[PDB]
Design a protein around this nucleic acid. Sequence first.
RNA 1: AGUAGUAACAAGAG
RNA 2: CCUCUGAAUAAACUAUU
RNA 3: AUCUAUAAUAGUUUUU
Lengths: 732, 737, 358, 103
Amino acid sequence: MDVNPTLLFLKVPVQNAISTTFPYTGDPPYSHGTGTGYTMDTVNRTHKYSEKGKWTTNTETGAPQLNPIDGPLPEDNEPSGYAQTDCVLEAMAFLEESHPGIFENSCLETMEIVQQTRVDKLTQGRQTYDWTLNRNQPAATALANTIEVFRSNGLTANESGRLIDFLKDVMDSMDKEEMEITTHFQIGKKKQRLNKRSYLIRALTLNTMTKDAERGKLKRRAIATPGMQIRGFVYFVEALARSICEKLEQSGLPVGGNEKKAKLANVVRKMMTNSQDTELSFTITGDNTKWNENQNPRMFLAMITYITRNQPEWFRNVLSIAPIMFSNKMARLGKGYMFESKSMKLRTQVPAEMLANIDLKYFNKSTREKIEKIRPLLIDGTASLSPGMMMGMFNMLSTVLGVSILNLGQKKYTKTTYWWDGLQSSDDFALIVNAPNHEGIQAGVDRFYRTCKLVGINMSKKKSYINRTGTFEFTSFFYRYGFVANFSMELPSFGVSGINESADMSVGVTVIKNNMINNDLGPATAQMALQLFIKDYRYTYRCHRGDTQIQTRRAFELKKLWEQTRSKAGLLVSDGGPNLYNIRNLHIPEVCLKWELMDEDYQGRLCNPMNPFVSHKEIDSVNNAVVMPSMEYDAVATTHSWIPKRNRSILNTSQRGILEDEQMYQKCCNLFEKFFPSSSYRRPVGISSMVEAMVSRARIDARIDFESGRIKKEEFAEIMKICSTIEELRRQ
Amino acid sequence: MERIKELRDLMSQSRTREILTKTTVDHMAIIKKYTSGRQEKNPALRMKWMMAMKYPITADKRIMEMIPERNEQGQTLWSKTNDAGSDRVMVSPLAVTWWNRNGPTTSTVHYPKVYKTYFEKVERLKHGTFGPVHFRNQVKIRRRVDINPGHADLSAKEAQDVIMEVVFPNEVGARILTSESQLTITKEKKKELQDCKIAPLMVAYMLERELVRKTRFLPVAGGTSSVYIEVLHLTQGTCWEQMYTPGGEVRNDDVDQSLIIAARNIVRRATVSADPLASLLEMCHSTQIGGVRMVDILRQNPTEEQAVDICKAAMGLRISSSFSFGGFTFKRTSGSSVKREEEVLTGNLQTLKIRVHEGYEEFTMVGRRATAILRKATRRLIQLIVSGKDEQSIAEAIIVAMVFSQEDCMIKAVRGDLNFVNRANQRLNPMHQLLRHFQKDAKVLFQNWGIEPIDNVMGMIGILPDMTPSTEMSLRGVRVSKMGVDEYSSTERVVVSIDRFLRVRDQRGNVLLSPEEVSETQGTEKLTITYSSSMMWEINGPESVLVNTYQWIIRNWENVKIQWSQDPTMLYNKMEFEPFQSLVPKAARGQYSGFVRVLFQQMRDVLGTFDTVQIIKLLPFAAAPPEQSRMQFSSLTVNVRGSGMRIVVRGNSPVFNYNKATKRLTVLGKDAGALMEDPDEGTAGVESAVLRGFLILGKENKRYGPALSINELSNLAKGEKANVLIGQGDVVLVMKR
Amino acid sequence: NMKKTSQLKWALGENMAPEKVDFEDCKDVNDLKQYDSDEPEPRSLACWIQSEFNKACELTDSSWVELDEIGEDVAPIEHIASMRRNYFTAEVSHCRATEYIMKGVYINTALLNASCAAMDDFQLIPMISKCRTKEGRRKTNLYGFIIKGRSHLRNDTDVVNFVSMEFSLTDPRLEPHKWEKYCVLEIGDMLLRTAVGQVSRPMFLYVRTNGTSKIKMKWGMEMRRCLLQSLQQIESMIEAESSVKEKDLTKEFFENKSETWPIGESPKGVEEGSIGKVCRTLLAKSVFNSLYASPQLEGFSAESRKLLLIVQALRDNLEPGTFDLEGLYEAIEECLINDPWVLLNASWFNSFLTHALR
Amino acid sequence: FEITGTMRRLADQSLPPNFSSLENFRAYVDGFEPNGCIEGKLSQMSKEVNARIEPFLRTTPRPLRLPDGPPCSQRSKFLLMDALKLSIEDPSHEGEGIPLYDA
RNA sequence: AGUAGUAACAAGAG
RNA sequence: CCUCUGAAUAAACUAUU
RNA sequence: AUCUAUAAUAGUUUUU
Ligand SMILES: *O[C@H]1[C@@H](O)[C@H](n2cnc3c(N)ncnc32)O[C@@H]1COP(=O)(O)OP(=O)(O)OP(=O)(O)OC[C@H]1O[C@@H](n2c[n+](C)c3c(=O)[nH]c(N)nc32)[C@H](O)[C@@H]1O
Ligand SMILES: [Mg+2]
């Protein structure tokens, strides 16, 4: 009897067992080598989707640019980027008509946000392409380097601390005839001068790479990272788009999780109720093919221009800068390639800056064709990519465009017996079409398809399907008369996080509890998950029970602690103790759970503030009250809240000196916390220099203490003298 | 002195001086995150890799002076190699477990105070009570609940301001605590934290854990209170419910809210009964709210609400003919009204329904800091007299009275981006939204309300849209006095008589309350409500009532089928259909009943046409006294969470859908069970339970001309066959009996 | 630490990476060219993968998992959960897939620890496992040996080579195509008792070179998650019924075995198993997903989910429609190249298509 | 917030084909009124650009096509069904003794 | 050789 | 021979703090 | 009755 698991679907509906279709217990696919091939393929495909457009040369950068806007209307079903400007404007106008005042209120809120936002908002994120180093750096590091260069080039509006002043600095730097930066080598400092066009090309460049660990894809794909100059404008544009999306029912963003599921269910049921009882209703689960390679920045500029009508000119300019910068963008090719010689048995790395004029005998047929097609677009080591949105950017503005097309489906606009509505989320969509008969359904689907074609949106025919209303799929949520649970999606979260012992224990128990609450994880399976997690935890941290004979380097200490302890149940699992968790007490921290079972000596040693595994404060001498470290998933800090080592790769590079710098920064920051205690709790805001603020605080504190009698006049005189000395040092 | 000396020392050096001089306070945040890079992308893999190393942990240099380099067996506990980018050294977990067993011992007596919330969770779990486990058909609903209760009358920003004031008095910037609650809480916490010896940052985090309120969207069943949401994983499951009561103290407001919800549900289900009073009494005696019998709460709880008053009158307790609105206690001295759903257009171009009360009425409003007498008609404020303490109290009372009057001027004064749906697209109460909108700023409301000259009677002062004491002209119908209080008589519980049909009457004989005056809103309870009876779903929400009604019909399909075939009169009178009949719109009930019953009769007159699904679908609708008519229904409505959801007579519907491939019934997405096939089912494609006086013969037949609508079937005669557009885009040939 | 002999140096890929030089210093080499980036060579499905899956779903006479203790039961729901967990553990601890889980977890843990601790050494790692016989006594089992190569692994995709030697009683000349990567020796004669008489059979040592990365080792160390993915599903099914019956049905399903689900096929037709058989089949499927993880499997699952949903809509009388169905078939088939697991899944999908639409 | 210099020229080079200045485009947008633009464009577009629905019946789907070639071979890291184990009745729990001693 | 799969590892650098 | 090192995309959401 | 406060960390979703 051959075992066929799939046959289980002959009795269990596919949705009710959808979790079986996710093979998320194996490792996900990874990319091994370079991403240059994928970047070249993306650029060539983006230009192919717009080949019938207008070719021009940019007078500021010299890069060829392709303009498909107002291009020929398609005669077939292949993807195309020939959006019609009048149609996009009409879609925006009708969206405004259906929801009066949406754009006005959105613009008011966005004006407040723009006027209030601080520059430190840019420090958020993981990486950022640093134009001063032609590679990726941490966002804070990139911002610091850019501010330093601007200050060296006489661009200091950012001192105001407002993001918009930083954008003014960027705009003013665009007009500089030259820029000067510093470079490191084998760890000296040298000066480099960039002419206007070189700096302009660097400012419009987005780095590219390959994405790793993505589920459900056979082939790899490319992703992009924006530069420092464009982040602020994109942030403001996305704030406006978020404000707009918050006011639309069809929008699937920016809501998520249970709230998103509730909103989608409410919207779908309202659509069902509005449907007449004597007309067919169908639902289309749809995908859009190459959404980001067919959307054009110029159409986003048009949409922003229409949205910001009757608004102050400065607001319109600051919003319009982003599409302007994105339609003149460049793409970094990547690492390059590697060549191998079998006879000589050697390997070498060929950088991507040489692809412009490298002989094509080394490459195979596919790569040779890629390079030949892309060579005309290569400038200064990058590729000219005018059309298309690169990767995962302007998601909410794309959502607005999709929702406008959905809004075009009302009977007041179709002017016939069929109509449609549905749900939009970036590029994914579900479409409910109502019509008296099947021919009406066909006509409505065709009209929706063609209207999407007009605005440069292509419905994926091979990934989209249609059935009767009642079941569909949207953004990986499977609706079968209501959304169904999918446990396999969250399954990778089970295990050991890798923060430390306390945090990992908390994360494991909390994950089990949350999956019980949300993903329909049963009681018995919850208990078995707890057992498996404790097993994995003990094996990872070498903290098996003290009454066992598992051979590990940590077993001797645990055995001694177990033998010297009277109350065993009070010991943590990290100390070789037993497991006291069950269903009823998954919501309680481990240390608090067994606090009333710990020996006094063990409890005091565990929660001893003077433990070198957690740092110490400096108020008075040392805050010897509680173990204090960023305490995520760690309610109570103990000796098990230690911190692991750091990666030491940079020690073999020229950037290792940067370590010193950051250390020194910390030093200074530490001192600032001795004058302003609230800085750690809440972020300080000011324009004065750190030294000036500290000296002023010292003077005012001395005066207040002397007036209130907390200090004697000798200390006051000494503090004033030292303040004067610091003032003298400030000038010298 | 140490701070200034260290600052001078740093300023002496060049790099430190440059950093301190060129860096503003704003850029201090940027440089604080400055780093060479945290090259970690797989923390779990990295942890597994590192734990195989000799010295994966980092520790301060002090460890070299506190822990020996080797233990008894010579195993190394730490090394002298520093961590890159810092001055900390590398150590082994053996060091941690050596400290835990041989380190110096301190006094950890204040930890329970620092982490009071978690030990409070432990105490609540310790003293909790466990009941039985019931297996049922759970219907979890996605709603916003609170996971951190925080303080009652505070928000996130207010709590943060209070924390800053208490812990960082000099860092509060320009904020001033204007709310009375904020000032009182600040004083109380300063008194409590007087002469504290804990670090300010940890005190701030403690106050954050104690005071800040946190809410999240979760799929919940039962109670939405914080104490009931912390153990949500234990008490509610996909198919089971565990009875559990937290062991702490219960807030009074939660008890009041739960009592109001329970009373409303009980009264609504009792109205549809043949003997409402006895049903209400037994339901009250069979209900618990958070582990406490409902009768005890009704005895010891002073709640002003219509349904609670009806329950108290049924139990013989003295009541108050008062309700709450906008923070004021309204009490109708005279007049009467009838509710009516009216569609209106908002000032900001929004269309919404409102429950307008018609008729003339007079009320007295009592507030914590204001009092008034109001006289109104249908969407018309006849007059208002306000005697508040200061300008703010009178303004608030005026706004509440204006919104209460349901004036068109008030509706047209709505401006800005005001929404009448939740962020999850769930309907909100229009009156509460209007109150919240106009309480922030009522300048436009006052400007558009109107002005009118006054007669200067009794010396009562005037008031202008600018909120000033005028004497010639004042706001239309509004007057300001000083001697109007009559507040003692508000708490004057009176003895009343309750009729069999739940009509509360005064000693004189005038009607005070009736079931029609109870709100139709279907809310959720803060504390879990437990019902003990044959039907534990008798006073549940609409979705649970629907699913359980159809599940009951399916489970008892054998005797139900026999009874339907033999003696239908007794079947329609089952007590199980009454909760379902409560959901059907009242004005429609009889009509629907009539319709359905006729179908069944035809289903018995014509043999060979016995569809189980049709009978199961339509049976709950035949439980009301029939009203004869000739109307044709293609669907029957049911009120679910304020929306009218339709059940289609023929074919599947969003609510009730039957699947033949699996032979399974789904009600609102919940599996009600699998029907069992009967040999008597008619396998001939003939339907005789769709139209009131017609028999569906087959699919489309082009012989008899084009199809016509359902409502145009009254022109046919006996024996005439015709094509009808009955169903979802389907045309079928039918004949008239 | 094994000595760096010539045989081990060859078998473990010692000094096999080409020397890394600058392009300027080698641009004039005649045969210098790009790395070979050809697509995988196609392979056809064989019968041995189905037999592997059939055996992996069978019951054993030894307990392979000894789950850890938890807190005491106080609430009635905890008692019900403990009873159901006893049923689940009894069903899942005596499965061959659980043995594979333990074997893989142990091997990957040992390989990772050796790789970190001994970067530049050839270590000898026995393949050990622990079980308990039906009578309840412990037993230690040896499967073979592994020899580790150098583990100077920088990226998460860097490969550490090793040599795997494993005992077996399977004659390698019955299905030679299955063992193209192995060099099978003969190392002894083993006496086995069939009924009452002893019989002598050859004992073979399958020897091969293999490799693994840190990501693969890490995901092999976490193979116990497979258990959850099965049990959860099973429990859901049970609960789905209790709701409509308003009573726990764990004992009814496990003991009475009244309700069955189609789980396989025979020459007669579709075969239905009990709840335990379904649980073991799902566990085996999860374990094989873990052992045979590849991009082809990911692509096939993602692409065939849509076709499953379309067939489901057809079976629900929801009048499904398509636009470019041939495009969907091409997308599905683009992922079937050479992986036995993905090919077997495709065959299973074809069988399901045959049985569902009849 | 003003757009001047390099930024103004980049803006002038970021418009639909028939516009040469940012201010001209803004003037066009401010006065825009929807007058049958979408309907006209739809009328112009050919009827080959359509989404024709093909019913999915029980006889529509076909079996998947598996690749041809030599049979696939074992690729697991260890033997699965062909494994043989040498066992000892050692009274020990999981991972207690020395692996080499047990071997 | 082997892992693997559209490009890499089979140690790199000083 | 010897020294060092084992590798951080965007948006939104979820959980904890 | 309403309910998008910030910042850190990890996980999930978003293919010609
Ligand atoms: O949490 C909900 C409810 O339980 C809670 N509540 C209600 N009563 C109390 C008390 N007494 N203490 C504490 N909490 C209480 O407040 C929430 C109310 O929710 P919801 O069900 O949405 O409100 P309701 O449906 O009751 O309508 P509401 O707008 O609040 O009106 C209250 C009351 O006033 C009556 N009413 C309004 N108007 C305009 C009236 C009128 O013109 N004439 C007459 N006779 N009555 C009028 C409402 O119908 C209700 O009776
Ligand atoms: Mg989709």
